[PDB]
Amino acid sequence: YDIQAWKKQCEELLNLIFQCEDSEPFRQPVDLLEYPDYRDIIDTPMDFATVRETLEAGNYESPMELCKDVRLIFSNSKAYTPSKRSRIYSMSLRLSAFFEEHISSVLSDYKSALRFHKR
Template structure:
């Protein structure tokens, strides 16, 4: 059953991600599910820059050296680094915020999978993930506000267009012979 799905997250992982502030593919959170629009990309860029500019991001800026760690690909199936995430963002490959957060989450998970708990890179991943989660909450709030603001303004436009005064009606020329419309 899991192999037939596009994306499978075990129940434990789903609970852990939700607890960490990440949303699963089935989540109903509007900022996570909504398609990113042009106004959202500066927010996502800010999120990436918050992580990439941090002094503890040095291990994640470039791919892991396979010369230095020849067994890396035996342990980490889907390697990713900040340069890949940046390129995807530049190419507008992220359709939804959840796509971006999935890559960021994988970055941190890969570090914890490969490096021992007492390793500097493991600790950098933990620190950066906390910073990312905090910034992600702010970005989600901004995107939700935009989405909800748009919905409100659209409904107000519809409501106000139905609620007009008679003095707003266009003057109709009454010189028209009404019998002209009779069959």
């Protein structure tokens, strides 16, 4: 029933993602000195510190908006990878599976609570 519970649930999921070794390439914006052509391929950079900062600033209205930004981290890694077997892309696939497994109930509970609110 709680329309606000998604926020702390997302904060706790972000804490687990930060503890995950697979999140290391995605914890801060991609370094353009390391990947000089990054912005030639990627239009909208995104990383987990920016997602956490947006959430803590009160700049997400719903967990769907947070989920769109986290999915953008993974789609950027898929678009920038030179190979489907690269180390960083392989880490992104595992982290994506972990994130999707945990965000599903957060989205479901929020949408259910909102439908109840508008009944």
